[PDB]
């Protein structure tokens, strides 16, 4: 921006600059909560012994493990930000991490979750089919 202004003074004359901050923890939590909705993260049995929020404001009550999943996703984004900061402080050549990284992470999570649930369900139904076949073989043996 320092030399962008020098090249074109009209950038601070006719253009009202609007600064977009990086997506806040609230924004990341909302994106994660909305996008991880087709996913079935509802586990009836779940216990929370500790207190580790990142959003800090909405639904701090004992979650349904879905709030916990989204909280962990936002923590992953924050942790990568701290990793970049520490890498820059103790050296150099760090790389900017954007909200598009968060969107790609959520898409990867959704797709991988779908694949790794579908494969287990199909192998379970194959196992049930095999059990039925073995029962049919037992019937033949009894005959």
């Amino acid at each position: 921006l320092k030399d962008r202004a020098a090249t074109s003074p009209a950038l601070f004359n006719r253009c009202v600059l609007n600064w977009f901050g990086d997506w806040s923890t609230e924004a990341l939590y909302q994106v994660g909560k909305e996008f991880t909705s087709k996913m079935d993260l509802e586990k009836p049995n779940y216990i929370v012994p500790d207190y580790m929020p990142v959003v800090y404001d909405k639904l701090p009550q004992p979650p349904s493990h879905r709030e916990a999943i989204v909280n962990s996703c936002v923590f992953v984004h924050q942790t990568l930000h701290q990793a970049n900061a520490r890498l820059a402080k103790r050296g150099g050549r760090t790389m900017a991490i954007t909200p598009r990284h968060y969107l790609d992470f959520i898409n990867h999570y959704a797709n991988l979750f779908h694949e790794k649930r579908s494969e287990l369900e199909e192998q379970q139904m194959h196992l049930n089919v095999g059990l039925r076949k073995i029962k049919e073989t037992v019937d033949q043996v009894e005959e």
Binding site: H65, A68, I69, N71, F75, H101, Y109, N111, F113, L127
Partner: protein, 429 residues
């Protein structure tokens, strides 16, 4: 749930960081998940959860190094949403991806080529992979391609590549790569690609050397480590294969009773392999308890190897002629491992490690110093001596003494500098 969470967080976010930073990220995420009781299974292997046996095997067939970093890079390369941008100072990744895509006729093109647009439009229509190198001069016409902003509202899927519109073939995958180990990128390009980084690092050398010495010395721990990995699914995969073979035999024989051995053999084999898998799972406590001991036994050698190689790499600063590649150090290491004249007779492991470490130091000094002026032999020799001194455990590191020896005589002070005895001078005082 949490297991796929960690895997996807690794795939989408990490990839530009080195092995040490990737592992630190993964262990921090795992600690956070376990502390919040998001149930994820421990002793995870990212590589075999995100890949199966045949994919890894075909990867190794198509020129992939056995290092875990290369396997994780290949994992990031098979499954991705943002088209990968390859960071490899050498060329194993580029030839790897050329091999992985022969059957789909991957075209090789570069941004510096004037026919880049011609080679890209034809590739995108024909639906074949296109790999573009030299991303330093990234061409901004790829922004619609990297954004995947193709308008599906129209009857046919048309992308507005430039002024004119081109239909996007579903099989079009673009690949970006560079020849430079480390360079800054504009954030707009950064947000549109999945950085996959093949650049080698001290931790990468440590892992490679530890794997190589474990394969060479004590093959038994290496084979049982491989078995530990195979305990994650692909043994279960072969279990399912035998299950479906049994199912096919069941209606192949139609429940024959006169000749029952045809199915009895399969049932006995299934029982034996189930017992074997149960024994392996129940030994998962005994294993990784002596495996960790063996790995820590061979850790000083690996850290010495990494330190030696990176001292060789930094030898550029001493003199322009001191130019050594990673392959030269790999040749040195393979020489000290698989053709030592000193390892023909000795078979005990604790002595074998001492011989390997000593001769590795010696061969590194010999090969490097043979191409050095006869005023730097002492410099390299005593840098190697310092590396060995940090390697050994019988005596302290003497960090303060080395720091003084190097630069502590530059401390400025003028108190008590007057010589006291007649047998002394001002500089000596």
């Amino acid at each position: 749930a949490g297991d796929c969470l960690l895997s996807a967080a690794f795939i989408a976010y990490a990839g530009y960081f080195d092995q040490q930073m990737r592992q630190n990220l993964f262990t921090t995420w795992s600690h956070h998940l376990q502390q919040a009781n998001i149930q994820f299974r421990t002793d995870i292997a990212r590589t075999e959860y995100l890949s199966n046996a045949d994919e890894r095997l075909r990867w190794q067939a198509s020129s992939l190094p056995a290092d875990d970093l290369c396997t994780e890079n290949a994992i990031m390369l098979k499954r991705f949403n943002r088209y990968p941008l390859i960071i490899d100072p050498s060329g194993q990744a580029t030839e790897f991806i050329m091999n992985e895509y022969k059957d789909r006729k991957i075209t090789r093109t570069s941004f510096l080529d004037d026919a880049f647009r011609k080679n890209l439009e034809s590739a995108l229509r024909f639906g074949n992979p296109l790999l573009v190198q030299d991303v330093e001069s990234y061409d901004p016409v790829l922004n619609p391609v990297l954004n995947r902003e193709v308008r599906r509202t129209g009857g046919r899927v048309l992308i507005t590549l430039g002024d004119q519109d081109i239909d996007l073939s579903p099989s079009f995958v673009i690949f970006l790569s560079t020849r430079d180990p480390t360079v800054e990128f504009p954030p707009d390009l950064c947000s549109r690609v999945t950085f996959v980084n093949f650049t080698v690092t001290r931790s990468s050398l440590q892992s490679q050397c530890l794997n190589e010495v474990l394969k060479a010395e004590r093959p038994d721990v290496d084979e049982k480590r491989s078995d530990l990995l195979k305990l994650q699914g692909e043994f279960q995969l072969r279990l399912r294969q035998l299950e479906k073979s049994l199912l096919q035999a069941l209606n192949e024989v139609k429940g024959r009773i006169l000749d029952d051995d045809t199915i009895i053999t399969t049932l006995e084999n299934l029982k034996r392999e189930a017992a074997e898998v149960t024994r392996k799972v129940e030994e998962t406590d005994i294993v990784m308890q002596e495996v960790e001991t063996v790995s820590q036994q061979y850790l000083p050698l690996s850290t010495a190897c990494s330190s030696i190689y990176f001292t060789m790499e930094s030898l550029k600063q001493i003199h322009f002629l001191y130019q050594y590649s990673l392959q030269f150090f790999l040749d040195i290491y393979h020489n000290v491992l698989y053709e030592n004249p000193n390892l023909k007779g000795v078979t005990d492991h604790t002595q074998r490690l001492s011989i390997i470490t000593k001769d590795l130091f010696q061969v590194a000094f010999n090969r490097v110093a043979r191409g050095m002026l006869h005023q730097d032999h002492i410099t390299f020799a005593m840098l190697l001596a310092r590396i060995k001194l940090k390697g050994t455990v019988g005596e302290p590191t003497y960090d303060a003494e080395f720091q003084h020896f190097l630069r502590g005589n530059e401390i400025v002070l003028s108190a008590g500098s007057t010589p006291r005895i007649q047998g002394l001078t001002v500089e000596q005082a």
